[PDB]
Amino acid sequence: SDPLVVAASIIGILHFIAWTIGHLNQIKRG
Amino acid sequence: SDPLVVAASIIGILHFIAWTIGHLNQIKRG
Amino acid sequence: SDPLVVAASIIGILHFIAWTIGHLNQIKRG
Amino acid sequence: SDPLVVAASIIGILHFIAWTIGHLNQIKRG
Q1: Which of D5, D12, D25 is facing C11, going by the closest CB pair?
Q2: Can you tell me the distance from the alpha carbon of C25 to that of D15, in angstroms, rounded to the nearest whole number?
Q3: What parts of the sequence cross the membrane (chains A, B, C, D) (predicted)?
């Protein structure tokens, strides 16, 4: 009777996937 | 009872729209 | 008592002030 | 005890840990 807080959770794990991409900066050329 | 936990949710979405900006580096810095 | 959930919120506001720095990518690379 | 809400918190502390890495850009630039 309150999936509002849980629903938002999906957003937390989601950003993680993208976080991996940004890593590209820390490797090539440095 | 107060929307204390909910209010934080608004902060979660903000990350998504901004994340799109940082992507400019990954895709092409022009 | 259950300030466990609230505590997490405090950390959320923190990421915001720092996000400002990330802007550098844009402010530099058109 | 329905640690569903707590699990989400773990994601918050994670950001901070990685967040310092990204800092490498300003604190140094080869």
Answers
A1: D12
A2: 19
A3: 3-15
